[PDB]
Amino acid sequence: XXXXXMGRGSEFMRNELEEMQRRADQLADESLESTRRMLQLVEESKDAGIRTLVMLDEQGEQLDRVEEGMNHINQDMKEAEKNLKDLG
Amino acid sequence: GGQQMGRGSEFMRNELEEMQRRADQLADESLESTRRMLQLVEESKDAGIRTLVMLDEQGEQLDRVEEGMNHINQDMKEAEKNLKD
Amino acid sequence: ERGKILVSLMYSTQQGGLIVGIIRCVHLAAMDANGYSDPFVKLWLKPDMGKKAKHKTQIKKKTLNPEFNEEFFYDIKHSDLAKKSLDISVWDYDIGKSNDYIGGCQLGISAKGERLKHWYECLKNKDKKIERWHQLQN
Amino acid sequence: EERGKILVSLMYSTQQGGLIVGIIRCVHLAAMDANGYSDPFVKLWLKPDMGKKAKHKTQIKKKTLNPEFNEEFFYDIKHSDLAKKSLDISVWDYDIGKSNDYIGGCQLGISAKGERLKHWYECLKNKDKKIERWHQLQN
Amino acid sequence: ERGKILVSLMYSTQQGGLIVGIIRCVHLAAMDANGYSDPFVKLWLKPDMGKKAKHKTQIKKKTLNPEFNEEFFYDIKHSDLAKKSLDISVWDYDIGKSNDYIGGCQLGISAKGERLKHWYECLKNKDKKIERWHQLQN
Amino acid sequence: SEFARENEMDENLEQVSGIIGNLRHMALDMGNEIDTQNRQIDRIMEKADSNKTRIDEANQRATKML
Amino acid sequence: XXXXXXXXXXXXXXARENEMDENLEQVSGIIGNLRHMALDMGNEIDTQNRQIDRIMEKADSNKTRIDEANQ
Ligand SMILES: [Ca+2]
Ligand SMILES: [Ca+2]
Ligand SMILES: [Ca+2]
Ligand SMILES: [Ca+2]
Ligand SMILES: [Ca+2]
Ligand SMILES: [Ca+2]
Numbered sequence: 001x002x003x004x005x006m007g008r009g010s011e012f013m014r015n016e017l018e019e020m021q022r023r024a025d026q027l028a029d030e031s032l033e034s035t036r037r038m039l040q041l042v043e044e045s046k047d048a049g050i051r052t053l054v055m056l057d058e059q060g061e062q063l064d065r066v067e068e069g070m071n072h073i074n075q076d077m078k079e080a081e082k083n084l085k086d087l088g
Numbered sequence: 089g090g091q092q093m094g095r096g097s098e099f100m101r102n103e104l105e106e107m108q109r110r111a112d113q114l115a116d117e118s119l120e121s122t123r124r125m126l127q128l129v130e131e132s133k134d135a136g137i138r139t140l141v142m143l144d145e146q147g148e149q150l151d152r153v154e155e156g157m158n159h160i161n162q163d164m165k166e167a168e169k170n171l172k173d
Numbered sequence: 174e175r176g177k178i179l180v181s182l183m184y185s186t187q188q189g190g191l192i193v194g195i196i197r198c199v200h201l202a203a204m205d206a207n208g209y210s211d212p213f214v215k216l217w218l219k220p221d222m223g224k225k226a227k228h229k230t231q232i233k234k235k236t237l238n239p240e241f242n243e244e245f246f247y248d249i250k251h252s253d254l255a256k257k258s259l260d261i262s263v264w265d266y267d268i269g270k271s272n273d274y275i276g277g278c279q280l281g282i283s284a285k286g287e288r289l290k291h292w293y294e295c296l297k298n299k300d301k302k303i304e305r306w307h308q309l310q311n
Numbered sequence: 312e313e314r315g316k317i318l319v320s321l322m323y324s325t326q327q328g329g330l331i332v333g334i335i336r337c338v339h340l341a342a343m344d345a346n347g348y349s350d351p352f353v354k355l356w357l358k359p360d361m362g363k364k365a366k367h368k369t370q371i372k373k374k375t376l377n378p379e380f381n382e383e384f385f386y387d388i389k390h391s392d393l394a395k396k397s398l399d400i401s402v403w404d405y406d407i408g409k410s411n412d413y414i415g416g417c418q419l420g421i422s423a424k425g426e427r428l429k430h431w432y433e434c435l436k437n438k439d440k441k442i443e444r445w446h447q448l449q450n
Numbered sequence: 451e452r453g454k455i456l457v458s459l460m461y462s463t464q465q466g467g468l469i470v471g472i473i474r475c476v477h478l479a480a481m482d483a484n485g486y487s488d489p490f491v492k493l494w495l496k497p498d499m500g501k502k503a504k505h506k507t508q509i510k511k512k513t514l515n516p517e518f519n520e521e522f523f524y525d526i527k528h529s530d531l532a533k534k535s536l537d538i539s540v541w542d543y544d545i546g547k548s549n550d551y552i553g554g555c556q557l558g559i560s561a562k563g564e565r566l567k568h569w570y571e572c573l574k575n576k577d578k579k580i581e582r583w584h585q586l587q588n
Numbered sequence: 589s590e591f592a593r594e595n596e597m598d599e600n601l602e603q604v605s606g607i608i609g610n611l612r613h614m615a616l617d618m619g620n621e622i623d624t625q626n627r628q629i630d631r632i633m634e635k636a637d638s639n640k641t642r643i644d645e646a647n648q649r650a651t652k653m654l
Numbered sequence: 655x656x657x658x659x660x661x662x663x664x665x666x667x668x669a670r671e672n673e674m675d676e677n678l679e680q681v682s683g684i685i686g687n688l689r690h691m692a693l694d695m696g697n698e699i700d701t702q703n704r705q706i707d708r709i710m711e712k713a714d715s716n717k718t719r720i721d722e723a724n725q
Contacts, residue, residue, distance in 0.1 A: 031164070057436065066128040076121065093567065105533070119596075119597065626693065
């Protein structure tokens with residue numbers, strides 16, 4: 001006598017059991033694919049964010065030239081009026 | 089009864105020659121200033137448009153992830169409901 | 174003696190691609206002894222993949238201000254359009270010898286000035302024709 | 312694996328005002344000859360199109376599947392204007408009697424993806440810094 | 451001998467240029483047979499003053515103290531007047547022959563002494579009339 | 589005489605003060621795009637962590653037949 | 655062996671779920687980097703946004719010095 005803890009197995013008839021063995025792989029394969037599909041989506045958004053950082057740093061370093069250019073021009077215009085009043 | 093002109097001959101030629109140059113050097117710098125301001129502000133506008141591209145083409149990638157996350161919730165729930173018996 | 178060219182761009186959602194329209198050119202550079210030229214416009218999109226992405230207009234005869242008024246199509250998604258550039262070339266068609274190079278203009282994200290602003294206003298305004306002029310260079 | 316990898320070193324020197332591309336060595340390259348080895352040489356292409364001086368090539372190594380170049384190249388460009396550009400690194404097998412055999416390639420730039428894009432990113436962030444990393448040839 | 455001339459120079463700001471003033475000559479050189487002369491002053495701006503820089507005074511009759519009292523204007527900026535040089539010449543008008551050269555004077559940077567002092571004090575003192583006596587010679 | 593090249597100065601200054609205003613607009617609208625995406629990432633992780641729990645609470649199985 | 659009393663045995667398989675834990679670990683990690691960039695992208699904009707206002711002052715100061723010089 002045995003006592004287990006679905007329970008069947010005596011005479012050969014309708015299976016109804018291979019499904020619960022196949023339907024488990026379907027949920028397992030769709031779970032691995034789900035983990036694979038999420039990894040592809042977030043990795044592509046990571047690279048897309050990197051391609052945006054190189055553009056922000058491009059515009060940032062270009063804004064430094066615009067600010068430094070306004071200072072260089074401001075000094076040059078001051079040297080223009082400074083040398084005009086003393087030498088003339 | 090002070091004094092006659094001493095070292096004033098060559099001094100005057102320096103005050104007049106520089107007045108010719110210093111008056112036109114200021115006008116030439118005013119022309120170079122507007123050109124240098126253009127070559128910097130315009131180039132910064134181009135960098136802002138290239139950034140607006142990569143940024144707006146990133147929002148569509150986040151939309152592909154969010155809509156891709158919900159597409160996975162369907163296939164996960166469809167696999168759980170199908171796995172009953 | 175470089176000239177301009179009128180280019181019209183639009184992304185058709187119904188057709189599913191880019192509509193490049195070559196209207197006309199103004200004050201083109203002469204490349205024939207008769208003071209005129211036989212101009213036609215070539216089109217070549219940036220080939221991120223390997224396929225035929227070429228388009229050519231018809232050949233006008235003896236004119237420096239042609240009037241093509243033609244349109245061309247490229248079946249590319251709107252998402253994959255920012256990563257490409259359009260190369261517009263104007264040539265003087267010769268019968269015997271090889272054709273001469275008159276002008277050229279590239280439109281893309283790597284462009285500059287109006288050559289970039291024209292390509293950007295199409296990525297932001299879909300199903301709307303954007304026609305602007307561009308100066309031909311070497 | 313498969314076609315091998317290449318050791319590339321990128322650096323932007325502000326004192327020179329240009330990118331310093333360095334091809335050090337390659338490992339496990341694909342044998343494209345009948346003797347079991349290959350004659351590798353690295354060709355560098357940093358331009359989208361009409362380039363006057365943008366085609367750099369290393370010296371051709373003799374009958375080797377693991378070459379060692381230890382070379383450096385210089386591309387003249389504006390102060391950090393390599394965002395719009397993308398460096399294409401190709402490995403070829405030199406054939407005297409016919410066309411050269413293509414071994415593998417590499418793409419470094421904003422158009423790249425994964426390890427190739429990150430190598431191009433860290434080169435533009437830290438100036439006057441030598442950054443080197445391995446990259447798998449082709450896909 | 452050879453004569454002395456009284457010249458008044460002034461740069462007008464509201465009018466925009468130099469106001470040259472030929473006033474009076476004293477003891478000019480005799481260049482005729484009757485012992486006198488028919489003088490007239492011809493001032494010239496030689497530093498590349500392109501279109502019409504040769505102003506001439508009216509011809510006086512047989513005289514020994516010619517009082518011209520004529521003023522002339524030169525539309526030029528104060529900046530570019532420093533590199534200038536005014537050549538003031540005096541001639542004797544003859545009937546049916548060429549004019550005899552009585553005297554001459556030069557005012558500008560190339561000058562020296564009283565001639566350079568006159569050209570200097572006018573550019574330094576704007577809106578002020580500066581008149582001095584200069585000696586004529588070959 | 590030919591000082592018509594002075595009009596280029598006022599034409600550049602008109603564009604300088606104008607493009608700078610476009611830089612002000614591009615930078616402000618650029619921040620609005622990132623602030624919208626930043627609140628979108630916080631919405632993606634909630635749907636991503638929900639997928640993780642729906643997998644762990646499903647990939648635990650001992651109902652196999654030997 | 656045979657008919658003893660109270661025993662057991664190891665099937666005897668001398669899986670593919672270590673990936674699921676590895677992928678979800680890499681997924682949840684990169685999402686942390688997505689916030690890292692998005693926050694650092696906003697800090698850079700605010701830096702550049704204040705930088706534009708600082709340029710507009712110097713851009714108008716150069717304009718006034720040009721107008722007060724070219725008359
Ligand atoms: Ca021809
Ligand atoms: Ca022809
Ligand atoms: Ca071979
Ligand atoms: Ca070979
Ligand atoms: Ca006489
Ligand atoms: Ca006479």
